Coordinates of C-alpha atoms in Angstrom, one line a residue:
Chain A
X255 CA 49.9 -15.5 -21.5
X256 CA 51.8 -12.2 -22.4
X257 CA 50.3 -9.5 -23.8
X258 CA 46.1 -8.6 -22.5
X259 CA 43.1 -10.1 -24.0
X260 CA 42.1 -7.8 -26.7
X261 CA 45.3 -7.5 -27.7
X262 CA 46.2 -11.0 -27.6
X263 CA 43.0 -11.5 -28.9
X264 CA 43.8 -9.1 -31.6
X265 CA 47.8 -10.6 -32.1
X266 CA 44.9 -13.9 -33.2
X267 CA 43.1 -11.8 -35.6
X268 CA 46.1 -10.6 -38.1
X269 CA 47.8 -13.6 -38.0
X270 CA 45.6 -15.8 -38.7
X271 CA 45.1 -12.7 -41.7
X272 CA 49.2 -13.5 -42.5
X273 CA 48.0 -17.2 -43.2
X274 CA 45.9 -16.4 -45.6
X275 CA 48.3 -14.7 -48.0
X276 CA 51.4 -17.3 -47.8
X277 CA 49.3 -19.8 -49.6
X278 CA 47.1 -17.5 -52.3
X279 CA 50.7 -16.2 -53.6
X280 CA 52.6 -19.2 -52.7
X281 CA 51.8 -21.9 -50.5
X282 CA 49.2 -24.2 -50.9
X283 CA 45.1 -24.7 -51.1
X284 CA 45.2 -27.6 -50.4
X285 CA 46.4 -28.1 -47.0
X286 CA 45.4 -23.9 -46.0
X287 CA 42.2 -25.9 -44.4
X288 CA 45.4 -28.0 -42.2
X289 CA 47.0 -25.1 -42.3
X290 CA 44.5 -22.7 -40.2
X291 CA 42.7 -26.5 -38.9
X292 CA 46.1 -26.4 -36.8
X293 CA 46.8 -22.5 -36.3
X294 CA 43.8 -22.5 -34.7
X295 CA 45.1 -25.4 -32.7
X296 CA 48.3 -23.6 -31.3
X297 CA 46.6 -20.4 -30.9
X298 CA 42.3 -20.2 -30.0
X299 CA 42.4 -24.2 -29.5
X300 CA 42.6 -25.6 -25.8
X301 CA 41.9 -22.2 -24.5
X302 CA 39.1 -21.7 -24.8
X303 CA 38.4 -20.5 -20.8
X304 CA 41.2 -18.8 -19.7
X305 CA 40.4 -16.1 -22.8
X306 CA 37.0 -16.7 -22.4
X307 CA 35.5 -15.7 -19.2
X308 CA 37.0 -12.8 -18.2
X309 CA 38.8 -11.6 -21.3
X310 CA 35.0 -11.7 -22.3
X311 CA 33.3 -10.9 -19.6
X312 CA 35.9 -7.9 -19.2
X313 CA 35.6 -6.3 -22.3
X314 CA 32.1 -6.7 -22.1
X315 CA 31.8 -4.7 -19.6
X316 CA 34.5 -2.8 -22.1
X317 CA 31.7 -3.1 -23.8
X318 CA 34.6 -2.3 -26.9
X319 CA 31.8 -4.0 -29.9
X320 CA 35.0 -3.6 -32.0
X321 CA 36.6 -6.9 -30.3
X322 CA 33.1 -8.4 -28.6
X323 CA 32.4 -8.9 -33.0
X324 CA 35.8 -9.9 -33.2
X325 CA 36.0 -12.7 -30.8
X326 CA 32.4 -13.3 -31.9
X327 CA 33.8 -14.3 -35.4
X328 CA 37.1 -15.8 -33.5
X329 CA 35.0 -18.3 -31.9
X330 CA 32.8 -18.8 -34.3
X331 CA 35.0 -20.2 -36.2
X332 CA 36.8 -22.2 -33.9
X333 CA 35.7 -25.9 -33.1
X334 CA 32.8 -25.1 -30.5
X335 CA 33.8 -21.9 -28.5
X336 CA 31.0 -20.2 -29.2
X337 CA 29.4 -23.0 -27.0
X338 CA 32.3 -21.5 -24.1
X339 CA 31.3 -17.7 -25.0
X340 CA 26.8 -18.8 -24.7
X341 CA 27.9 -20.7 -21.1
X342 CA 30.2 -17.7 -20.0
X343 CA 28.1 -15.1 -21.4
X344 CA 24.9 -16.0 -19.9
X345 CA 26.0 -16.3 -16.4
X346 CA 27.1 -12.3 -17.6
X347 CA 23.9 -12.0 -17.7
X348 CA 22.6 -13.7 -14.7
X349 CA 24.7 -12.0 -12.7
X350 CA 25.0 -9.5 -14.1
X351 CA 21.1 -8.5 -14.5
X352 CA 20.9 -10.4 -10.9
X353 CA 23.2 -7.0 -9.4
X354 CA 19.8 -5.1 -9.2
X355 CA 16.4 -7.0 -8.1
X356 CA 18.5 -8.0 -4.5
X357 CA 19.8 -4.8 -3.6
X358 CA 17.3 -4.0 -0.2
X359 CA 18.9 -0.8 -0.5
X360 CA 18.7 0.2 -3.7
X361 CA 14.2 0.2 -4.6
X362 CA 15.4 3.7 -4.9
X363 CA 16.7 2.9 -8.2
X364 CA 15.9 0.3 -10.6
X365 CA 13.7 -0.1 -13.3
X366 CA 15.4 2.2 -15.3
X367 CA 18.8 0.2 -14.4
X368 CA 16.5 -3.2 -15.1
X369 CA 16.4 -1.3 -19.1
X370 CA 19.4 -0.7 -19.1
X371 CA 20.5 -4.1 -19.1
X372 CA 18.1 -5.1 -21.5
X373 CA 19.1 -2.8 -23.9
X374 CA 23.5 -3.3 -23.5
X375 CA 22.4 -7.2 -23.3
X376 CA 20.3 -6.1 -27.0
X377 CA 22.8 -4.0 -28.4
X378 CA 25.6 -6.5 -27.8
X379 CA 23.5 -9.0 -29.7
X380 CA 22.8 -6.9 -32.5
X381 CA 26.0 -6.6 -33.3
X382 CA 28.9 -8.3 -31.3
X383 CA 26.6 -10.9 -32.3
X384 CA 25.6 -10.0 -35.3
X385 CA 21.7 -11.0 -34.6
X386 CA 22.6 -15.0 -34.1
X387 CA 19.0 -16.7 -32.1
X388 CA 21.7 -18.8 -29.8
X389 CA 22.2 -16.1 -27.8
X390 CA 18.8 -15.3 -27.3
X391 CA 17.7 -18.0 -26.1
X392 CA 20.6 -17.6 -23.5
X393 CA 19.0 -13.3 -22.9
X394 CA 15.4 -15.2 -22.3
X395 CA 16.2 -18.0 -20.5
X396 CA 18.9 -16.5 -17.7
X397 CA 16.5 -13.3 -17.2
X398 CA 13.8 -16.1 -16.7
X399 CA 15.7 -18.1 -14.4
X400 CA 16.8 -15.3 -13.2
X401 CA 13.6 -13.6 -12.1
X402 CA 12.1 -16.5 -11.4
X403 CA 13.9 -15.8 -7.8
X404 CA 11.9 -11.8 -6.5
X405 CA 8.7 -11.1 -7.9
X406 CA 7.6 -9.1 -6.0
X407 CA 10.4 -5.9 -5.4
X408 CA 9.9 -5.6 -9.6
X409 CA 7.1 -6.0 -10.3
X410 CA 5.6 -3.6 -7.7
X411 CA 8.7 -1.0 -8.7
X412 CA 8.0 -2.2 -12.5
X413 CA 4.2 -0.9 -12.1
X414 CA 5.7 2.6 -9.7
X415 CA 7.7 3.0 -13.5
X416 CA 4.9 2.4 -15.6
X417 CA 3.1 5.0 -13.6
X418 CA 5.3 7.2 -13.7
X419 CA 5.9 6.4 -17.6
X420 CA 1.8 7.6 -17.7
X421 CA 2.4 10.8 -16.3
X422 CA 1.2 14.6 -18.8
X423 CA 4.3 16.8 -18.9
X424 CA 5.7 18.5 -21.3
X425 CA 8.7 17.2 -21.7
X426 CA 7.4 14.9 -23.9
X427 CA 5.4 14.7 -27.0
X428 CA 6.3 11.9 -28.5
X429 CA 4.6 9.3 -27.1
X430 CA 6.4 7.3 -30.5
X431 CA 8.8 6.8 -27.9
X432 CA 6.5 6.0 -25.1
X433 CA 4.8 4.0 -27.5
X434 CA 8.3 2.0 -27.6
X435 CA 9.5 2.2 -25.2
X436 CA 6.4 0.8 -23.7
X437 CA 7.1 -1.3 -26.2
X438 CA 9.7 -2.2 -24.2
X439 CA 7.9 -2.2 -21.0
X440 CA 6.0 -5.2 -21.7
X441 CA 8.7 -7.5 -23.7
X442 CA 10.9 -7.2 -21.2
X443 CA 8.8 -7.2 -18.1
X444 CA 7.3 -10.6 -19.4
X445 CA 10.8 -11.2 -17.6
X446 CA 9.3 -10.3 -14.7
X447 CA 7.2 -12.9 -12.3
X448 CA 4.6 -12.1 -9.8
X449 CA 2.3 -9.9 -12.4
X450 CA -1.1 -10.1 -10.1
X451 CA 0.8 -8.0 -7.7
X452 CA 1.6 -5.9 -10.7
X453 CA -1.7 -6.4 -12.0
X454 CA -4.1 -5.4 -9.1
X455 CA -1.6 -2.2 -8.7
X456 CA -2.1 -1.4 -12.4
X457 CA -5.7 -0.7 -11.1
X458 CA -4.1 1.3 -8.1
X459 CA -2.6 3.5 -10.8
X460 CA -5.2 4.5 -13.2
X461 CA -7.1 4.9 -9.8
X462 CA -4.2 6.9 -8.4
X463 CA -3.9 8.6 -12.0
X464 CA -7.6 9.3 -12.9
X465 CA -8.4 10.7 -9.9
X466 CA -6.0 13.9 -10.0
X467 CA -3.7 14.7 -12.5
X468 CA -4.5 13.2 -15.9
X469 CA -3.1 10.3 -18.1
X470 CA -0.3 10.5 -20.8
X471 CA -2.8 9.5 -23.6
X472 CA -5.5 7.9 -24.2
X473 CA -4.2 6.2 -26.6
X474 CA -1.4 4.6 -24.7
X475 CA -3.8 3.6 -21.7
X476 CA -6.0 2.2 -24.9
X477 CA -2.8 0.4 -26.2
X478 CA -1.5 -0.8 -22.6
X479 CA -5.0 -2.6 -21.9
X480 CA -4.6 -4.4 -26.1
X481 CA -0.9 -4.9 -25.0
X482 CA -1.6 -6.5 -21.7
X483 CA -4.4 -8.6 -22.3
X484 CA -1.7 -11.0 -24.0
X485 CA 0.9 -12.5 -22.1
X486 CA -1.7 -12.8 -19.4
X487 CA -4.9 -14.5 -19.2
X488 CA -8.2 -13.5 -21.0
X489 CA -10.6 -12.7 -17.5
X490 CA -7.0 -10.3 -16.5
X491 CA -8.0 -7.8 -18.1
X492 CA -11.9 -7.6 -17.6
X493 CA -11.4 -5.3 -15.0
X494 CA -9.6 -2.9 -16.7
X495 CA -12.0 -1.9 -19.5
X496 CA -14.7 -2.6 -16.7
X497 CA -12.7 0.3 -15.0
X498 CA -13.0 2.0 -17.9
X499 CA -16.4 1.6 -19.2
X500 CA -18.0 2.4 -15.2
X501 CA -16.1 5.3 -16.0
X502 CA -17.5 5.8 -19.2
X503 CA -21.4 5.6 -17.6
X504 CA -20.0 8.2 -14.5
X505 CA -19.3 10.5 -17.8
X506 CA -22.5 9.3 -19.1
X507 CA -24.5 9.9 -16.0
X508 CA -22.9 13.0 -16.0
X509 CA -24.6 14.4 -19.4
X510 CA -27.8 13.2 -17.4
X511 CA -27.2 15.6 -15.3
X512 CA -25.9 18.0 -16.4
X513 CA -29.3 17.8 -19.5
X514 CA -31.3 17.4 -16.5
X515 CA -30.0 21.0 -14.9
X516 CA -30.5 22.1 -18.4
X517 CA -33.4 24.0 -17.3
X518 CA -33.0 24.6 -13.7
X519 CA -30.7 26.3 -15.4
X520 CA -27.6 26.8 -12.9
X521 CA -25.6 30.2 -12.1
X522 CA -24.4 29.1 -8.7
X523 CA -20.8 28.3 -7.8
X524 CA -20.8 25.0 -5.7
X525 CA -20.2 22.1 -7.3
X526 CA -21.5 18.2 -7.3
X527 CA -20.2 15.4 -8.3
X528 CA -19.7 11.8 -8.0
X529 CA -18.4 9.0 -10.9
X530 CA -19.8 6.1 -9.4
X531 CA -18.1 2.3 -9.9
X532 CA -19.0 -0.9 -10.0
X533 CA -16.6 -3.1 -7.1
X534 CA -15.9 -6.1 -9.9
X535 CA -14.1 -3.9 -11.9
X536 CA -11.8 -1.2 -9.7
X537 CA -10.2 -1.6 -7.0
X538 CA -11.7 -2.1 -3.4
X539 CA -13.5 1.2 -1.5
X540 CA -15.0 1.1 2.0
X541 CA -16.0 4.2 4.4
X542 CA -13.7 5.4 6.4
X543 CA -15.5 8.0 9.5
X544 CA -15.0 11.7 8.1
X545 CA -16.7 14.2 8.2
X546 CA -18.4 16.9 6.2
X547 CA -19.5 19.7 6.0
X548 CA -23.4 20.1 6.4
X549 CA -24.3 21.5 3.3
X550 CA -21.9 18.3 1.3
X551 CA -24.3 16.7 3.1
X552 CA -26.7 17.7 0.8
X553 CA -25.1 17.5 -1.8
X554 CA -25.6 13.5 -1.1
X555 CA -28.8 13.4 -0.4
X556 CA -29.5 14.7 -3.9
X557 CA -26.0 12.2 -5.1
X558 CA -28.4 8.8 -3.3
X559 CA -32.2 10.7 -5.4
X560 CA -29.5 10.5 -8.6
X561 CA -28.9 7.2 -7.8
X562 CA -31.5 6.0 -7.7
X563 CA -33.1 5.8 -10.9
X564 CA -31.0 4.6 -13.7
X565 CA -30.9 0.7 -13.4
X566 CA -32.7 0.3 -10.0
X567 CA -30.9 -1.9 -7.8
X568 CA -29.4 0.7 -6.4
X569 CA -28.2 1.7 -2.9
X570 CA -25.6 4.1 -1.2
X571 CA -22.1 2.8 0.2
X572 CA -20.8 6.5 -0.8
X573 CA -17.3 7.6 -0.6
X574 CA -16.1 11.6 -0.1
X575 CA -12.6 11.8 0.3
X576 CA -10.8 10.7 -3.0
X577 CA -10.9 12.6 -5.4
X578 CA -9.2 16.2 -5.9
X579 CA -11.1 18.9 -5.9
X580 CA -10.5 22.2 -7.7
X581 CA -11.0 25.7 -5.4
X582 CA -10.3 29.9 -5.4
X583 CA -8.4 31.2 -2.5
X584 CA -8.9 34.4 -0.1
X585 CA -5.1 35.1 1.5
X586 CA -3.9 39.5 0.5
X587 CA -1.7 39.8 -2.0
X588 CA -4.2 38.4 -4.8
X589 CA -7.0 35.3 -5.1
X590 CA -5.5 32.3 -6.9
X591 CA -7.2 29.8 -7.2
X592 CA -6.1 26.2 -5.9
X593 CA -6.3 22.3 -6.9
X594 CA -6.1 19.7 -4.2
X595 CA -7.3 17.0 -2.2
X596 CA -10.4 16.7 -0.5
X597 CA -8.7 15.6 3.1
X598 CA -6.8 19.0 2.2
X599 CA -10.8 20.9 1.1
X600 CA -12.3 20.0 3.8
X601 CA -8.9 21.1 6.3
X602 CA -9.8 24.2 3.9
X603 CA -13.7 24.4 4.5
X604 CA -13.2 24.9 8.0
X605 CA -10.8 27.9 7.3
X606 CA -13.2 29.5 5.6
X607 CA -15.7 29.7 9.6
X608 CA -12.8 31.3 11.3
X609 CA -9.1 31.2 12.0
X610 CA -7.7 30.2 14.6
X611 CA -8.8 25.8 15.1
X612 CA -6.4 23.2 16.8
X613 CA -5.4 19.4 16.0
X614 CA -8.0 18.4 17.8
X615 CA -11.1 19.2 16.7
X616 CA -9.1 19.9 13.4
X617 CA -9.2 15.6 14.3
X618 CA -13.3 16.0 14.8
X619 CA -14.9 18.1 13.1
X620 CA -12.6 16.7 9.9
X621 CA -13.0 13.3 11.8
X622 CA -10.4 11.9 9.4
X623 CA -8.2 8.6 10.7
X624 CA -4.0 9.8 11.6
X625 CA -1.9 8.1 8.9
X626 CA -4.2 10.1 6.3
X627 CA -4.3 13.2 8.2
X628 CA -0.9 13.1 9.4
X629 CA 0.2 13.2 6.2
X630 CA -2.2 15.6 5.1
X631 CA -0.7 18.0 7.3
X632 CA 3.4 16.7 5.1
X633 CA 1.1 18.4 2.1
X634 CA 1.4 22.3 2.5
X635 CA 3.4 22.2 6.3
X636 CA 6.6 20.1 7.6
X637 CA 7.4 22.8 5.7
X638 CA 6.9 25.9 2.9
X639 CA 3.8 27.0 5.8
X640 CA 2.3 30.0 4.1
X641 CA -1.1 28.4 3.7
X642 CA -1.2 26.3 7.4
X643 CA 0.5 26.6 8.6
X644 CA 1.3 24.2 12.0
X645 CA 3.3 24.9 15.1
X646 CA 6.1 21.4 14.6
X647 CA 8.1 22.7 11.8
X648 CA 10.3 20.2 10.1
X649 CA 10.2 16.0 8.7
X650 CA 9.5 15.4 13.2
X651 CA 5.4 15.8 14.0
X652 CA 4.3 16.8 17.3
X653 CA 0.5 15.8 18.0
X654 CA 0.1 19.6 18.5
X655 CA -0.9 21.3 15.9
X656 CA -2.3 25.3 16.1
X657 CA -3.3 26.9 12.4
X658 CA -3.7 30.2 12.4
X659 CA -4.6 30.7 8.9
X660 CA -2.4 33.3 6.6
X661 CA -3.7 36.3 5.2
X662 CA -0.2 36.0 3.2
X663 CA 0.6 34.1 0.3
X664 CA 3.2 34.6 -2.6
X665 CA 4.1 32.8 -6.2
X666 CA 3.6 33.7 -9.4
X667 CA 1.5 31.2 -11.0
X668 CA -2.6 31.1 -10.5
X669 CA -3.9 27.6 -10.5
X670 CA -1.9 26.4 -7.8
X671 CA -2.1 23.0 -7.9
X672 CA 0.0 21.9 -5.0
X673 CA -1.1 18.1 -4.0
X674 CA 1.3 15.4 -3.6
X675 CA -1.2 13.8 -1.4
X676 CA -3.5 11.5 -3.6
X677 CA -0.5 11.8 -6.6
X678 CA 1.5 10.1 -3.5
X679 CA 0.8 7.0 -1.1
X680 CA 2.4 5.8 2.0
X681 CA 4.0 2.5 3.0
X682 CA 1.1 0.3 4.7
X683 CA -1.1 1.5 1.7
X684 CA 1.7 -1.2 -0.6
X685 CA 1.5 -3.5 2.0
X686 CA -1.5 -4.1 2.1
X687 CA -2.5 -2.6 -1.1
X688 CA -1.1 -6.5 -1.7
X689 CA -1.9 -8.2 1.1
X690 CA -5.5 -7.7 -0.8
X691 CA -3.0 -10.3 -3.6
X692 CA -1.2 -12.0 -1.0
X693 CA -4.1 -14.2 0.6
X694 CA -5.9 -13.2 -2.7
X695 CA -4.0 -15.9 -4.4
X696 CA -5.9 -19.1 -2.8
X697 CA -9.0 -19.1 -4.1
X698 CA -7.2 -19.1 -7.4
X699 CA -4.5 -22.3 -5.6
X700 CA -8.1 -24.3 -4.7
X701 CA -9.5 -24.5 -7.7
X702 CA -6.9 -25.1 -10.0
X703 CA -6.4 -28.3 -7.0
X704 CA -9.8 -29.4 -7.7
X705 CA -9.5 -29.7 -11.0
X706 CA -6.6 -30.7 -11.3
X707 CA -7.9 -33.4 -9.7
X708 CA -10.7 -33.3 -10.9
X709 CA -9.1 -34.4 -13.5
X710 CA -6.0 -37.6 -12.4
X711 CA -6.2 -38.1 -9.1
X712 CA -1.8 -38.9 -8.4
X713 CA -0.2 -36.1 -8.1
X714 CA 3.5 -35.7 -5.9
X715 CA 4.0 -31.4 -4.6
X716 CA 6.9 -31.6 -7.5
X717 CA 4.2 -31.4 -10.6
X718 CA 1.1 -30.3 -8.3
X719 CA 4.3 -27.7 -8.4
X720 CA 5.0 -27.8 -12.2
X721 CA 1.7 -27.3 -13.3
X722 CA 0.6 -24.5 -11.1
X723 CA 3.8 -22.5 -12.5
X724 CA 1.7 -23.1 -15.3
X725 CA -1.1 -22.3 -15.0
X726 CA -0.2 -19.2 -12.8
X727 CA 0.7 -15.3 -13.6
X728 CA 3.0 -15.1 -10.3
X729 CA 4.8 -17.9 -9.0
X730 CA 3.5 -19.4 -5.8
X731 CA 5.4 -20.0 -2.8
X732 CA 6.5 -23.8 -0.7
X733 CA 4.5 -21.9 1.7
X734 CA 1.5 -21.3 0.5
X735 CA 1.5 -24.6 -1.7
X736 CA 1.5 -26.2 2.8
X737 CA -1.7 -24.2 2.8
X738 CA -3.3 -24.7 -0.3
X739 CA -2.9 -28.4 0.5
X740 CA -3.7 -28.2 4.7
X741 CA -7.1 -26.1 3.0
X742 CA -8.3 -28.9 0.4
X743 CA -8.0 -31.5 3.2
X744 CA -9.6 -29.5 5.5
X745 CA -12.2 -29.2 2.6
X746 CA -12.2 -32.8 1.1
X747 CA -11.0 -32.9 -1.9
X748 CA -7.1 -34.4 -0.5
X749 CA -6.6 -37.3 0.4
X750 CA -2.5 -38.1 1.4
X751 CA -1.6 -41.4 -0.6
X752 CA 0.3 -44.2 0.8
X753 CA 0.9 -42.6 3.6
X754 CA 3.0 -39.9 2.5
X755 CA 2.9 -36.6 0.8
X756 CA 4.8 -38.5 -2.1
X757 CA 1.0 -38.4 -4.0
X758 CA -2.1 -37.7 -3.2
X759 CA -6.1 -39.0 -4.1
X760 CA -8.8 -36.7 -5.3
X761 CA -11.6 -38.8 -2.7
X762 CA -12.3 -37.2 -0.2
Chain B
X19 CA -18.4 35.1 0.2
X20 CA -16.0 33.2 2.6
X21 CA -11.7 32.2 2.9
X22 CA -12.1 29.5 0.7
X23 CA -15.8 30.4 -1.9
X24 CA -17.1 27.1 -2.8
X25 CA -16.7 26.4 -6.9
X26 CA -15.6 22.5 -7.3
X27 CA -16.3 19.3 -5.4
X28 CA -15.2 15.9 -6.8
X29 CA -15.6 13.1 -5.9
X30 CA -15.4 9.3 -7.2
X31 CA -16.9 7.0 -5.2
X32 CA -18.7 2.9 -6.6
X33 CA -22.1 2.0 -6.1
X34 CA -22.9 -1.1 -4.6
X35 CA -24.6 -4.5 -4.6
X36 CA -27.9 -4.7 -3.4
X37 CA -29.2 -8.7 -4.0
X38 CA -29.0 -11.4 -1.9
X39 CA -26.0 -14.1 -1.1

């Protein structure tokens, strides 16, 4: 009640260490153990909360690994002080994890902080708790109890950060670290719940990663398929391996077509490339109304011709906007090459035939929807206008864009890769990619509950929730439980047993 | 020949079903 909690802890440490040698020289061994028992009651006995809540969490936040190990000793010797240690420090885990994801204004940085708290608690176990396992039990319990509460802020932020770690830079060439931080991704986000939204978003992420730019590594994606195969269903990693098999099918079609133009001897500059896919293992894509230069339409018909062979049973529903393409660009003061997107490639295709178009037939002769075309003009316009030049300036954009293509263009590099768009995405794009999972759980829980009542006739709702939580990779809301109860009654697999929702039957 | 001379068009797309449900 005079010194600080760490000061009193060091005093207790040294004062207990005093009482040994008293016996060692002169006092009695058989009263050494009564002496330490009494003294440890006098110092540490009956003070296992006012030392061990604040002065625990205070010196954990200060993270003095010497005194944390000291109190670990000083409360692993004592009568039961490690129980107070486990409870106070585990509540400390829950709250000091909870100081991340419940913050809706602070979603720009969540994943790195989660990695940080994971790292800190791991280090406090491995030295400050000296690889005891009770602490690990409280850790995992506390983490899962925490993240059952917010499922679909983290898994989406986590998916974006997983994709961010799946980028090809010049800074990283040791994928071993990215293997190790990938191991931390798997282990740490096994605490994070709602994995179906992460799963579908990772379909979106491999789409946005292959379709523009290039991945961090081949073995990185292979290791992720093998790792995410674990901890989820074995029919939950059928689509991803289907992605890479469909990519190999498209490459084999590429080899076949290149061999079939080996005797036609292409020397022309105009290229067509379609990597074709099936809708069972990929994100779904529906064509949107867009306008194509008629030679591209000729290439579409060529694509039909080479499409109709090789496992016929095939019928066109084409996409002609989702790729990125390399293009040479005429300007004054040099001819450099652009790596750009099809939304912008059509823009640049019209800025060959003339300079002087306006947003009316830029809206029309592209055909591009408003949501895509605004963000198309947020790249290389709304700033840095030396290729396209848009009459509204700044973040605010009005419907009056007047364009005259610029002769002037300056940069110090070749292969001018100015392409945010397809390695970016919009808010309602993310929201819609979430709703394609929201009322997609419907058939999942439908199948699960029809199988349950086909297995056990009576099951209260507080047990249906637990069987579903056992079975599924995401947490099911109480609203969705009412939703499936009512729809099962609509399709005659439930009857309310005893005229209340307490129990049910499988009678129609 | 043009202000962008066409060197590469590349696309990703889906091959679709053709059997009755």
